[PDB]
């Protein structure tokens, strides 16, 4: 077994949509948004323009392979499997991706789509010059999966990375999952809300 | 008494929280799949926001799910 | 029967540029618009930016399946489906889709798109900066087909004034108003049927 | 015959390239530009951005089916069709299209392609803020194709009952008036269509 | 008198509104699909917006739709 | 033999990417920039916003048909057919394209493609305000082919159709090739220097 | 064998994603920046805009022909080969690429994608209207692949700016790529990438 | 005197207009499907501007159409 | 000592660079593919940056790979 | 004397000029695909601009290609 015949195995048997549903099991979906850079603020139009890796993460089982004496991980494009279908609920803007549009697969059935993402969004930005800082919302979410069939859970200091020579500094981000039920069917469409408490620099 | 918590399926044990409620209101995401409800148990009947939509009661479990 | 073996129904079977009809009775499309945030105004230039969910919905009865012993719904994509040539006549900008275009599809053949979109409108912004505020007409209805192929309704639950409707923009919304308007031409059976809303708007003081 | 085998036979048997001929008989191409909305106007540049429904339309007989007992007009793809190779000579940017590439088609082989369009021009704008207006002049017509192969014939309407009440401009008189012309080399001409906008400010 | 109504296809029962009519006129979508028409009953004839083009009548049913 | 059968002919058999190869004989392109309008100048930034035919032409044998009681000349897509890697060498944005991405082809191989461009461009802009006018360099020329694979050529009244509209006014273009040796294979990737003199109107 | 023929060779039987693996050997990448023109500089949002060539190379051997009495180069497309999958981690706004997608594939395997690029970049813009200027670093490297699977090498002297628009704002000092090899704590090895840093200032 | 008129493939009557006339200039259009033409009849010889290029002349159509 | 070095696999001679050392700490990088780990020798244990985790030892090669 | 002449790759007639000579400098373009190189002939060796690297000569052919 070799690399070409593992993304032979993923590209020809795997199905972009097919949501990989172990019966009543939803797909376990790990996601975090790790802050990058904070470009573009508005207080007045609270209209913030930022920059972030969406560290997406889950189990598609069926991809799975023998890795005994072949390699452990291999690097799948996104357009031959399956993807979460998230989204930011309180989005501006498209997606505009800077990284190439591919997810490590390893072995065990795990995949790792973390992409490079810029994109606006509508979000407290009232109090960017304090010491407090704004603190800003945006939730993201599956948007036509609910929760049996998708989970969304998320899981440093993250100042570490987020760019040092940004017009901002990044002072502290929750990532707080929200489940709420609506009126017809079983559950509840799973959202995580992610809490940015950020600030202008000194200067 | 036992009341069925959400978002839970299931029914769990509240010693005399002395209500099941049943909060059912309208929001954007609503026309299609529905109004929201958050099930569960409290103390009291509780506190009504203009347009939001009651149920209380006191049978072991009855407050469950409808469709509507 | 499962997820994938009803994606593999919809997605070999139906047909994205096949109209479902029933014999002489339309598609019955059932829209709304549902408002978001009210991005860039001017008075000036009766120029609105604005996002907002095209809350959309029909029945292709072709699709159905035997939902008994198996999934109830699932999630198809817009390439794999027919969908409402829709279209906002007083339209300035084209379509930015932010979410994914992936509609909902029941086993009874209910179809549910509602995609967020960024578009921009030339409409009456004469009025912000008031008490009774500005009066925001925006035009939508089919391109191509008319009423007895497809047939616009607006619901209309006098759904809050505005619950959701962003708590962050510079305006804040007053009262939408969706009104179905049907008119005829001088040629063809009946009616190119489409719908106006209505958005009443003001700044935020 | 239903709607779906109709589209089944243009789809599959109606070639987008290969323009419709009947035999030394150029296609008929009837065009209209109908303006709906003047946005941006700078006097000192000579550019105008515009919107108008290029409200083209033509004679495509292989199409054509047996309508008696079946649907008079189906609407088909833009995709799917053969579609006249229309130019604005005069042109700054490229077409922005806001309604669905869909062309209406009747039994008879008569094909309805009119979209709606946003597009910038070089154009007079000299004389805008006046009672007379400025008069912009846009040309159009086919690039690649000459008249016995395309040829383009302009049209009753009061221009301006639609037109947006709604602009910072209002139109006064649009012209659209044909103009053959003759080059050194090829049997006959290049045909297109020179359209007149006389437009002003608002009070 | 029963006069075509629009946008439906059907005659319906006016007691006299003494004029079944037929407005005619030529908007933007118009050189495609046509003149658009709004046909109708009335007490009487109505009043003509300039270049809007009209035809009252008088017989049960003398205003359907042409082409 | 219809004009379809031709198209058929073309399309079908035809390949996008195989260079139109005569053994050691390149592939004669004559290329040929007509401006149109020159809109956006920043003296300050030697940025200008310019829009030009980039007026392409070529000879692909294998296409060639027999047209004598048949169509001299049809319009085939650009997707279908090879076509030059040209390239302008100081570009700042993108093509924009804004005629239909077609190319004319004559029954006797001759290709012609000349598609409607805007594009951004750094050059000598240092002059605008004068009488002389600045002199704007564009130099462009195949990015992966060389000379003996792709020869590149240049070839009227210059501005008797630039735009009568433009805030600008065209003085005079120079067409000159220049021809550049490489250190290791056989001889000079060849690249067009197009100089557009130009100025402010009054 | 002509041209042709051998275009029907690559295009037919190579794997646009098939990293060309040689067991345990990574494939050899030689990537460089030549820096073009410095467009837009704002030294309030440390933001660059910026123009380069991204001088990439590598070994795919099973492309390899037989070039004896046949053609020793030939043009491919990039969608028709593999391609590293190289990005800058700095990076504001996408890839807008100026040049035909088309990389240059000899006979012996070796494979030469070079783009011209547009792209901004959060960078060390402090210090631009000085003698010393502002040194502006650009992270680059493999998103998925580590050294292994590819290496990355900046393999310079040179005097880059002989050729760097002499008609920009702005004029080039000096450029160092000089690559950093990073352990991380899971697997055999270690994410391989590369720094170059741009010093630059403005003109008179 | 009959003379060929543009943009029309065909000859017409021109009762004395004294000449046929072959205007021919460059455009932009031009290098690939060559020099504008206009053809036509008048009752002089008409006036030059700066590089366009003329031909007159007076046999009952001797002003073609050329392929050069 | 012997000890681990990094970027490589492999062990290598330190005459007495007293200890081994193993630096793990968590980047951006990091909930995936995990904490950095820079392994390596020294004279003395070194100094200990703020959240940043350290092991020191002195049995020949004493600080190798975990693996998650 | 006869010196090979660029971008020709062929040797040509100059009647003393006394000089074959071999300009190679480094470019933008030249990581990959080398030095610029002009040949020619002249009249004396020429001047030296900085970096820019010279080979004159005056055997009957003596500047010709290298292979890199």
Known sequence: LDRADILYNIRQTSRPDVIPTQRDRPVAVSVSLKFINILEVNEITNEVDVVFWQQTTWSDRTLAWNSSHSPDQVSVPISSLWVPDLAAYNAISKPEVLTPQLARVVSDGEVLYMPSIRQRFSCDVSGVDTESGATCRIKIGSWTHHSREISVDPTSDDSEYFSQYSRFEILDVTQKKNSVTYSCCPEAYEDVEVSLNFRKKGR | ?68
């Open chain 2, 1 to 68: 008494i036992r009341c069925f918590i959400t978002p839970d399926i299931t029914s769990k044990d509240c010693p005399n929280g002395h209500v099941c409620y049943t909060k059912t209101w309208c929001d954007a995401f609503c026309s299609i799949r529905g109004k929201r409800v958050d099930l569960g148990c409290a103390a009291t009947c509780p506190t009504v926001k203009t347009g939001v939509d009651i149920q209380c009661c006191s049978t072991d479990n009855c407050n469950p799910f409808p469709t509507r």
